[PDB]
């Protein structure tokens, strides 16, 4: 606030820590600052480096980081700016195991600082990366790739101390690659062979044998976006081929189809469950990083990947029992796990809603596959937009209550998350307000007495979803439900009773004009 309007020549007092100096305006603390930022104390090197961001430009000269640190560059020395990445320890088969001793831990706090030291200076631009390298730190981050992998109630401080490293590698490899074109040559073949794209596939694929493992709350919420983020920042560089050859042997399609158990609902526990979770957790990451159909044009050209298609045939007939398959917390999260992988192929539409209509019978001791999953299958029908309702309402009266039932299930879903997407809602009003002409045999006369009812109740589902600002002044067929709304009222339709929720829908209707209000 005060001080940068007062930088005058005056005489200061001395820090403890330097040789001494007469006034100590702003370029000594930066300078502190400079020369001190590759403290190797975690905690202290982002204080340090944003207070340098914040404290460059308060020197009179009002330049910019991009260009001040070169023009101290070219007469302080290539050292000055290289020394600060240094360290002490810039070089043992007794570190093979995982071991505690207090150098090691120290060794990869040194190997945090030099690593993150640079990461700040790469996604900015104040010196570019040409300048940089031109060194210890690929050649300490290769000895460490290759040992990687390899005190039982303590060398686990160590693991965490290991597995805090490795994602911010990957992260300094995204800011080095999405940043300036000349690192896709810049960066030497003694690092981007398979010891990236290994540790990436171990990532990805069965990372609880590395020493990450799940009970830690943080970095495993953290770690697969910015592991997405770096395999969407490798298509600007030539290495699609390297990722594509170190993938396509392990989690291809001979995988998923030798891992579909024939005995799946079952006491099976580890290494069919957990792996099916980890290969679709990784090919739903895979689908988020774009690249699914750049793995698996699995089959043919009927616009259906064939291995999704067995995924739903095997999620349709694995319910199919004996008695009947026992359901659980997890032995259904597999379920919706399979579903919404198996959901994001192509489209993949039609052959849903087609599925469901059915009129195969069930004898236990046939629609029941709606009844379980029942959100997830909603909210794609909810993003399978202005179609769906007419692809359903194609068949209207052989089979009514389930066409009934699966408006209803949509309807509830959509209308519960109102207060975030608020469009999808009024979008399915007024697709399904112009589409009343498939569903004309229920609002007439000779109709058994349970359709009727359920009619009302679509009647203030579809109302109440929205409000009146799109109803009136012919909106759809907006005389054509108005009829059916008054045909409702006939004489032998009701007791009393089922008429109250009709009234109740009076506030929406009584803005209209002369005709038919008299009626």
Same mark, same amino acid.
């Given at each position: %606030? ?21 006034? @100590? ?10 020369? +001190? $930022? ?30 001040? @640190? ?11 700016? !290289? ?33 993150? $030291? ?20 690929? =050649? ?46 810049? @960066? ?25 493992? !799940? ?6 919420? +953290?770690?697969? *976006? ?5 395999? =969407? ?8 081929? !390297? ?16 891992? $579909? ?6 006491? *099976? ?13 990784? $090919?739903? &990451? ?41 359901? *659980? ?36 001791? /046939? ?9 997830? !299958? ?15 309402? &194609? ?9 009934? #039932? ?12 109102? #207060?975030?997407?608020? +469009? ?36 203030? %589902?579809?109302? &109440? ?29 009701? *007791? ?17 004009? /002369? ?5």
């Amino acid at each position: %606030k005060k001080h940068v309007s007062l930088n005058k020549a005056k005489k200061r007092r001395l820090p403890r820590g330097f040789p001494p100096s007469a006034s @100590l305006c702003l370029l000594d603390l930066v300078k502190w600052l400079l020369a +001190h $930022c590759g403290r190797p104390q975690t905690e202290c090197r982002h204080k340090s480096i944003e207070l340098f961001y914040k404290f460059v430009p308060l020197l009179p000269g009002n330049r910019s980081p991009n260009l001040w @640190l070169k023009d101290v560059l070219k007469e302080e020395g290539v050292s000055f700016l !290289i020394n600060t990445f240094e360290g002490g320890g810039c070089g043992l088969l007794y570190l093979r195991g995982p071991f505690s001793l207090q150098a090691t831990l120290c060794w990869l706090d040194l190997l945090l600082a030099a690593l993150e $030291c640079y990461n700040t200076f790469i996604g900015e631009r104040t010196v570019g990366a040409l300048q940089v390298l031109g060194s210890s730190l690929l =050649k300490a981050v290769a000895f460490f790739l290759e040992s990687i992998a390899m005190s039982p109630q303590e060398g686990e401080r160590y693991n965490y101390s290991k597995c805090t490293v490795v994602v911010r590698i990957m992260e300094f490899t995204t800011t080095l690659l999405n940043t300036s074109p000349e690192g896709w040559k810049l @960066l030497k073949k003694d690092l981007c062979n398979t010891h990236l794209m290994r540790v990436l596939v171990q990532t990805l694929c069965e990372p609880a044998s590395i020493g990450f493992n !799940i009970g830690d709350v943080q970095v495993m919420a +953290h770690l697969p *976006d910015v592991c997405v983020n770096l395999m =969407k920042a490798l298509k600007m560089s030539p290495y699609k081929d !390297i990722l594509e050859t170190h993938l396509r042997e392990k989690i291809t399609a001979q995988s998923i189809e030798e891992l $579909c158990a024939v005995n799946l609902y079952g006491p *099976d526990a580890q290494v069919d469950r957990s792996r099916l979770a980890a290969v679709v957790s990784a $090919c739903k &990451q895979l689908h988020r990083a774009g690249l699914l159909h750049n793995i698996l044009p699995s089959q043919s050209t009927d616009l259906h990947h064939s291995v999704g298609t067995e995924l739903l045939s095997l999620v349709y007939k694995g319910i199919a029992p004996q008695c009947l398959p026992s359901l *659980d917390l997890s032995c259904k999260q597999l379920a919706s796990g399979l579903l919404e992988l198996a959901f994001a192929f192509g489209g993949l539409c039609e052959r849903l809603v087609s599925l469901l209509l059915n009129p195969a019978v069930l004898s236990t001791a /046939g629609e029941y596959f709606y009844s379980l999953f029942s959100e997830t !299958i909603n909210t794609e029908l909810l993003k399978n937009l202005d179609l769906a309702v007419l692809e359903l309402m &194609q068949s209207s009266v052989d089979n009514t209550k389930m066409v009934s #039932a699966v408006l209803n299930g949509m309807l509830d879903q959509s209308f519960r998350e109102r #207060a975030n997407q608020k +469009h999808q809602g009024l979008k399915l009003a007024t697709t399904i307000l112009q589409h009343w002409k498939k569903c004309d045999s229920w609002w007439a006369k000779d109709s058994p007495l349970e359709t009727k009812m359920a009619v009302l109740a679509l009647l203030a %589902k579809i109302l &109440q979803i929205d409000s009146s600002v799109s109803f009136n002044t012919s909106h759809g067929s907006f005389p054509e439900v108005f009829t059916t709304y008054i045909s409702l009222l006939a004489d032998t339709k009701l *007791d009393l009773h089922l008429k109250g929720q009709a009234v109740t829908l009076l506030p929406f209707f009584t803005s209209l004009t /002369g005709g038919s209000l008299e009626e």
